[PDB]
DNA sequence: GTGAGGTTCTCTGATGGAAGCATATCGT
DNA sequence: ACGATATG
RNA sequence: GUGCUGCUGUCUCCCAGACGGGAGGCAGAACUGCACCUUCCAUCAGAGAACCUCAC
């Protein structure tokens, strides 16, 4: 259940503008790098309209520029990674249930991501059993730690073991263009994965061109979440307006939204479940009351004007 | 002076896709 | 109890 | 804030012209009047303008 609106902001500082204009280039690099790992020549649609054909040579050169010295040898593994990121694996046993989860092995030198099992079913039953007559070796002598290694050595989702294969070869940590923190990288990679997933669903529907992200031509949402998908934000009201401030690494960025007749007489309260409860009336004639929990807003620059897309959740 | 048959620009409509986070443990 | 990754 | 309409605003176009009216484009807003889930992508059908030749 979703319901969206749009609030205009006219005094965005330099920090948010640079964050919006710097998230796009990381997204574009993610799109081109995933296509490079895919190692399948494709068609690129430029801004003015031109379906150029890009072959394996430029793909290999781009991969070399990304740190993959000899993509010919690791071709059995780069491709095996990309299909995992673009959700081309089995619907069950996804190596990355959310695509943005992948940018910790790809773009973090000291990460140690692959050796985790605390959320693996099997370590949940044994730990709930320490503190054979139940429905599901290691039950004797207890030690769920050992079951962790038993379930990490085997039961490895394809593309996650493949990702760990390259890190020993010193080629997988890829130098992205800008030094975005984990959260903004995850937001950008979520957007890029969404755009390439749509592209591939269209390419297999046809059987064909790729449009890269642009700050003005084909904008994407620089999304701000409350659980690590993007930089955090907090919403409130002051009179008849919206007070939206985000928590960028350069500090807090506060912003006052010009009044909206869609959101009139606003009352806002923070919730203990990572959300903000807001009330409003639709103005016009009937002032029917609505309750909305907001958890993740978006930012889009259209016609030179900055708009936050307030995507809230209403009562069903 | 129109009809007919081809490019070359601005648009609008319909049917597809990707979407708008939950939990979990560990170290302080 | 709260923040830092990790991943359902 | 967004399609619709609305200068207390602007620019431009056309018809009578020295009374006005009829096209469009922005600024809107601090002016109502009906409503408002939306962003991006790729296809396919349809409608408009104009462009070139050859025929009647």
Residue A194, CB, strand B, below 7 Å: yes
- Residues A228 and A183 sit within 8 Å (Cβ to Cβ): yes
- Tallying the residues shown for chain A, one arrives at 316
- Distance between CA atoms of residues A64 and A83, nearest Å: 20
- Distance between CA atoms of residues A233 and A244, nearest Å: 7
The residues close to strand D, meaning Cβ under 7 A, are A 2-8, 45, 195, 198-199, 202, 206, 208-209, 211, 217-221, 258-262, 282-286, 300, 302, 307, 309, 311
Q: Residue A131 CA to B15 C1' — how many Å?
A: 54
Residue for token pair 């609106």: A5
Angle among Cα A123, A80, A95 to the nearest 5 degrees reads 25
- Distance between CA atoms of residues A94 and A284, nearest Å: 48
Could you give the dihedral angle defined by the CA atoms of residues A58, A59, A63 and A65, in that order, rounded to the nearest 10 degrees? 20
Residue A99, CB, strand C, below 7 Å: no
Among the residues of A207-270, which ranges form H helices?
none
Residue A114, CB, strand C, below 7 Å: yes
- Distance between CA atoms of residues A19 and A166, nearest Å: 31
Among the residues of A45-122, which ranges form H helices?
56-65, 75-85
List the one residue out of A297, A302, A132 whose CA is nearest residue A224: A297
List the one residue out of A80, A102, A225, A212 whose CA is nearest residue A159: A80
Could you state, in order of their start, the residue ranges of all structural domains in chain A?
A: 3-15+220-314, 18-117+155-210
List the one residue out of A50, A51, A72, A52 whose CA is nearest residue A61: A72
Q: What is the DSSP letter of A224?
A: B
Across A239-264, b (16+ Cβ under 10 Å) vs e yields eebbbbebebeeeebebbbeebeebe
Half-sphere exposure of A14 (CA within 13 A, CB side): 1
Token digits for A233? Answer: 């934000």
Contact residues for A211 (Cβ-Cβ < 8 A; gap 6+): A45, A195, A199, A218
- Residues A220 and A213 sit within 8 Å (Cβ to Cβ): yes
List the one residue out of A114, A116, A119, A120 whose CA is nearest residue A165: A114
Continuous segment of H or E residues that includes residue A297: strand A289-302
- Distance between CA atoms of residues A309 and A22, nearest Å: 19
Among the residues of A113-181, which ranges form H helices?
123-130, 144-153, 160-168
- Residues A311 and A300 sit within 8 Å (Cβ to Cβ): no
Continuous segment of H or E residues that includes residue A251: none
- Distance between CA atoms of residues A59 and A40, nearest Å: 8
Strands laid side by side in the A233-236 sheet: A233-236, A242-246, A253-257
φ, ψ of residue A243 in degrees (nearest 5): -110, 110
Token digits for A130? Answer: 């320490």
Give the distance from CA A235 to its chain's centroid. Answer: 21
Resolution (A): 3.3
Residue A5, CB, strand C, below 7 Å: no
- Residues A302 and A292 sit within 8 Å (Cβ to Cβ): no
Strand C: which bases are under 7 Å from protein Cβ?
5-8
Across A69-108, b (16+ Cβ under 10 Å) vs e yields eebeebeebbbbbbbbbbbebeeeebbbeebbbbbbbbbe
- Distance between CA atoms of residues A48 and A169, nearest Å: 41
Residue A212 in 3-state DSSP? Answer: coil
């Amino acid at each position: 259940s979703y319901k969206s609106s749009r609030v205009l902001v006219r005094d965005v500082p330099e920090e948010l503008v640079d964050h919006y204009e710097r998230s796009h280039r990381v997204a574009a690099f993610f799109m081109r790098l995933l296509l490079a790992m895919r190692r399948e020549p494709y068609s690129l649609r430029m801004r003015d309209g031109t379906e150029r054909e890009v072959d394996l040579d430029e793909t290999d050169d781009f991969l070399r520029s990304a740190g993959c010295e000899e993509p010919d040898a690791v071709s059995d593994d780069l491709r095996s990674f990309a299909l995992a990121v673009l959700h081309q694996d089995n619907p069950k046993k996804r190596a990355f249930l959310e695509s943005e989860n992948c940018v910790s092995i790809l773009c973090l030198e000291k990460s140690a991501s692959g050796t985790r099992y605390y959320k693996r079913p099997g370590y949940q039953l044994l730990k709930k059993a320490i503190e054979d007559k139940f429905e599901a070796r290691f039950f004797a002598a207890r030690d769920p730690d050992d079951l962790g290694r038993e379930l990490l050595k085997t039961d490895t989702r394809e593309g996650m073991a493949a990702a760990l294969r390259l890190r020993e070869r010193g080629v997988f940590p890829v130098s992205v263009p800008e030094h975005l923190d984990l959260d903004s990288l995850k937001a950008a990679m979520a957007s890029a994965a969404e755009r390439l997933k749509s592209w591939l669903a269209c390419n297999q529907r046809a059987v064909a061109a790729v449009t890269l992200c642009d700050a003005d031509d084909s904008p994407i949402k620089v999304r701000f979440g409350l659980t690590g998908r993007g930089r955090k934000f907090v919403l409130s009201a002051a009179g008849s307006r919206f007070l939206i401030t985000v928590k960028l690494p350069c500090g807090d960025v506060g912003l006052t939204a010009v009044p909206s007749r869609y959101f009139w007489n606003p009352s806002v309260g923070r919730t203990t479940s990572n959300s903000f409860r807001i009330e409003f009336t639709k103005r016009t004639t009937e002032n029917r009351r609505y309750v909305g929990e907001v958890k993740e807003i978006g930012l889009v620059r259209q016609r030179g004007r900055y708009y936050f897309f307030i995507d809230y959740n209403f009562d069903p």
